[PDB]
């Protein structure tokens, strides 16, 4: 009953969420910089959907980070390539900051 490792599946979804968020953030910036086009409703909607993504991404990263601890506590069971694992770790860490950097330029 061997199972397929879904880590890389969720990883791709997080990246996809990070890409959408980035597009939303650049939009937010362009709105908040020029209140010529920047109507309140559109600003509210953009800030809201940017949060909708930052939300999914943070839960996602929590879970992903935990699976790392699970593999490290039970390595024999999972049989993961060590370079691959280090990449998993670097993905979690770098995505954390990428998102963190968006949140900083927002909440201030």
């Amino acid at each position: 009953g061997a199972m397929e490792d879904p880590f890389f599946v969720v990883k791709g979804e997080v990246q996809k969420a990070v890409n959408t968020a980035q597009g939303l953030f650049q939009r937010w910036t362009e709105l908040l910089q020029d209140p010529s086009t920047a109507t309140r409703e559109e600003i509210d909607w953009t800030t809201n959907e940017l949060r909708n993504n930052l939300r999914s991404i943070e839960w996602d990263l929590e879970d992903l980070d935990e699976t790392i601890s699970i593999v490290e506590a039970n390595p024999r069971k999972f049989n993961l390539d060590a370079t691959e694992l280090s990449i998993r770790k670097a993905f979690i860490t770098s995505t954390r900051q990428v998102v963190r950097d968006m949140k900083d330029q927002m909440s201030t």
Binding site: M3, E4, D5, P6, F7, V9, V10, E13, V14, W59, D60, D63, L64, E66, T67, I70, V71
Partner: peptide, 12 residues
């Protein structure tokens, strides 16, 4: 995502 990870990793 949670359910996929839970199924394979046994999230607590």
């Amino acid at each position: 995502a949670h359910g996929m990870l839970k199924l394979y990793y046994g999230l607590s």
